[PDB]
Design a protein around this ligand. Structure first.
Ligand code: HEM
Ligand code: HEM
Ligand SMILES: Cc1cc(N)nc2cc(-c3ccc(OC(C)C)c(CN)c3)ccc12
Ligand SMILES: Cc1cc(N)nc2cc(-c3ccc(OC(C)C)c(CN)c3)ccc12
Ligand SMILES: C[C@H](O)[C@H](O)[C@H]1CNc2nc(N)[nH]c(=O)c2N1
Ligand SMILES: C[C@H](O)[C@H](O)[C@H]1CNc2nc(N)[nH]c(=O)c2N1
Ligand SMILES: [Zn+2]
Lengths: 415, 408
């Protein structure tokens, strides 16, 4: 059964057959659409029972992609995985399989607008890691390689898979590089309000907080199920960009800066039924992630009103669109600062344009591209980007990146 | 299965039980979400539909299972039996129309749902009669710029051969013409309809802002052209509160959004002609009607006049122009005392409406893909609001364009 999507701005129609290969559930039914739920339970322990069917499905996938489906290499590997499961209750991916699986988890990430780049992912195999110090070293190297002095390169570092769920590797940080947030007694917040809870855990674990507005948080790394340990990223590894505006000289005076490398570190990579609970991945920013969300979200730095004041806008009534007007300027300043400093960034027009090209190519060479419109459309100027008028089909393919509960809610403390 | 929606800006959690009363289907399955698909897809089935409607009607008036309810149920049951259809009482007609708007999950303006003015036009027999009812609707709803919400309901479908239809997609829309040098004058969204009207006997002035004639179909006959009296068409000249050169662009828009091509379903009955109107959200003109590439596409001209660097997208010249255009649209309407709401006020109103509906009704079906405005989405409160989308009845539905289905 085929399904079609129409771009209503160009009348281009595409035919999705890939959705038949879908296994996991969406959360929707015939009578309710959960398309705007941030985490369907579906999007968030496993025995030898249900494991070999998942392994077989992944290996069939993998050997098809190398055009060796049904070969002796394919059938022998199936048997080898079978015996390793029945005797060890898990199994180990070859290097080739791990690289393929990680690239395809990104290719499958239906909320990621940056997926045109999915095949150019540098995969770092950290499955020989055993300790938190070992994790810190792998992460430092990831940060150095990814940053590349501003010429950002996508990368992922994969720590050992889950076994009995009692020996998990976890990065307790939500991203490798994030700014601390401090709740003051007067109710205000210093730094990034998005990180107040994690900052407090860090301070509790012994971190001496500078209590500044842009303190890079320490790494809180959990190896093999042990209590997590604190490490400071060497500051020369943290590339940062002072935010200025090309016409507004007072903009520098807001004291703002941001870090160059977005490296998400709290998601779970699933490949052939194996669960990689620690797998930080990084690329480069779309400007709106910093300029719209990171600075202008009401629950974030919320510099909108200050920028509004310094522009001397009518802040009395909302219908003056002072918020809209200040948001654009803040996003101009983010792009201008990164480009001036030669730090890789992409604006939301370029990125959505690339994504449509990626999506059309995926429909032709792959039969489909799962896409989450609610997440693909940029958080400003939605309808003047090409993805707004693009119909999209959302479904869940494996390998996948999944959400998982924050470790501090599930961790059994050693003391 | 008593579902919960969370607002990630406020942490407010709402519990939705209203979805369990949902009947129609969304187009999604457990294996695929079609939440961004624009248009997903008689005798036997009529009495259950009527029962369901009358059950909810008599519940709303706190007389479920009373003398009146059971009597009306059999009365309708008898009429369907013989006549093969049935006729709504005035009271049920008004209830069904207010609740078809209440249930329109893509409508951000539903906090106003209970103040709808319903015009019963079920006695109309001709396109001329339809034109009379529509002029009265337009005059009432315009109200000299103090716009009022309104719906006019023409006779319900019978055999599909006697359909009442308004062929326009809105009562008031600007013409669009194909030009020699390839492009388009007027309004590109209306090029096919503008040529149908010409293909009917309309002498087009061939300007930018030519108000289209009405093309009215009664009882299934060929449609007829009618000119809306210009004194009934309120227009706003578009100028900018800071940029004096903006008036030089020669733009205007009409005050009354009156959508006329949808179908109103109440208790199984199908009202194929049911023009309804309210007032504009600024972005419906300034973002979509002016800046969409498939529309007026004046963005590049605005940013040019603003002397913005249009050589790279990363200057955000489009975004900068888009905001100025929408500031002007709001400034122009407000200066002329024509009702209009900005996207910040309307979305804030919609969160309050959602609050209300969960508290007094158990839920509110809401289509996030359509509720979030087409600009500045994440700084409006609906962006961070989880929503549940489901189809309740009475409802407004899509229907094919008549010129694809009418036997001439
Ligand atoms: C290289 C440039 C990249 C860009 C510009 C980009 C952009 C984005 C954006 C804007 C989002 C939406 C998140 C939000 O707005 O809060 C997103 C989601 C996401 N990105 Fe990408 N990303 C990039 C690279 C990558 C890489 C290298 C990976 C993994 C290896 C990745 C995996 C994801 C995932 C898993 C999500 C969430 C998807 C889901 O939950 O289905 N991205 N990305
Ligand atoms: C009075 C102020 C109103 C405002 C500000 C408003 C706003 C909107 C907006 C912005 C949309 C999205 C359409 C688009 O962006 O292209 C919409 C959709 C819609 N509106 Fe409203 N509206 C109002 C009144 C009404 C009334 C009076 C009715 C009917 C009685 C109505 C019925 C609908 C319907 C049926 C849809 C499409 C829903 C669907 O397809 O499921 N609206 N509205
Ligand atoms: C590699 C990469 C680059 C980039 N430029 N951006 C990225 C954004 C996410 C991301 C961000 C936010 C988010 O949502 C949280 C608010 C829960 C999720 C969840 N799927 C993923 C993940 C990876 C990204
Ligand atoms: C009374 C009213 C007021 C308003 N201020 N705005 C309105 C917008 C629509 C509307 C607009 C577009 C649309 O869909 C097209 C893209 C085909 C639909 C159908 N869902 C309804 C319908 C009624 C509206
Ligand atoms: C592809 C997408 O479904 C289509 O462009 C929709 C998206 N959301 C929308 N939202 C509103 N309010 N109005 C629209 O016309 C649309 N168009
Ligand atoms: C409620 C809603 O689903 C939630 O706020 C989502 C909406 N879409 C988003 N889209 C992107 N790109 N990033 C986000 O964080 C969100 N948040
Ligand atoms: Zn859905």
């Amino acid at each position: 059964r085929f399904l079609k999507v129409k771009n209503w701005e160009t009348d281009v129609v595409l035919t999705d057959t890939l959705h038949l290969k879908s296994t996991l559930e969406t959360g929707c039914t015939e009578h309710i659409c959960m398309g705007s739920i941030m985490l369907p339970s579906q999007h968030t322990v496993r025995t030898k029972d249900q494991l070999f069917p998942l392994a077989k499905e992944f290996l069939d996938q993998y050997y098809s992609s190398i055009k060796r489906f049904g070969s002796k290499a394919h059938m022998d590997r199936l048997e080898e995985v079978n015996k390793e499961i029945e005797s060890t209750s898990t199994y180990q991916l070859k290097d080739t399989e791990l690289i393929y699986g990680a690239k395809h988890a990104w290719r499958n990430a239906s909320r990621c607008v940056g997926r045109i780049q999915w095949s150019k992912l540098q995969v770092f195999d950290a499955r020989d890691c055993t300790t938190a110090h070992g994790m810190f070293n792998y992460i430092c190297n990831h940060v150095k390689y990814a940053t590349n002095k501003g010429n950002l390169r996508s990368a992922i570092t994969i720590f050992p898979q889950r076994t009995d769920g009692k020996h998990d590797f976890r990065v307790w940080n939500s991203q490798l590089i994030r700014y601390a947030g401090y709740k003051q007694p007067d109710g205000s917040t210093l730094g990034d309000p998005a990180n107040v809870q994690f900052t407090e855990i860090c301070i509790q674990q012994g971190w001496k907080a500078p209590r500044g507005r842009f303190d890079v948080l320490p790494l809180l790394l959990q190896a093999n199920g042990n209590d997590p340990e604190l490490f400071q990223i060497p500051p020369e590894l943290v590339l940062e960009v002072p935010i200025r505006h090309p016409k507004f000289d007072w903009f520098k005076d807001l004291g703002l800066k941001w870090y160059g490398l977005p490296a998400v570190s709290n998601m779970l990579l699933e490949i052939g039924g194996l669960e990689f609970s620690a797998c930080p991945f990084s690329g480069w920013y779309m400007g709106t992630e910093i300029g719209v969300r990171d600075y202008c979200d009401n629950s974030r730095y919320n510099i909108l009103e200050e920028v509004a004041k310094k522009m001397d806008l009518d802040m009395r009534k909302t219908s003056s669109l002072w918020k809209d007007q200040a948001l654009v300027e803040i996003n101009i300043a983010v792009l201008y600062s990164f480009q001036s400093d030669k730090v890789t960034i992409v604006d939301h027009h370029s990125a959505t344009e690339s994504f449509i090209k990626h999506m059309e190519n995926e429909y032709r060479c792959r039969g489909g591209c799962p896409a989450d419109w609610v997440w693909i459309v940029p958080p400003m100027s939605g309808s003047i980007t090409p993805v707004f008028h693009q119909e999209m089909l959302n479904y869940r393919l494996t390998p996948s990146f999944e959400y998982q509960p924050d470790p501090w809610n599930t961790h059994v403390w050693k003391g």
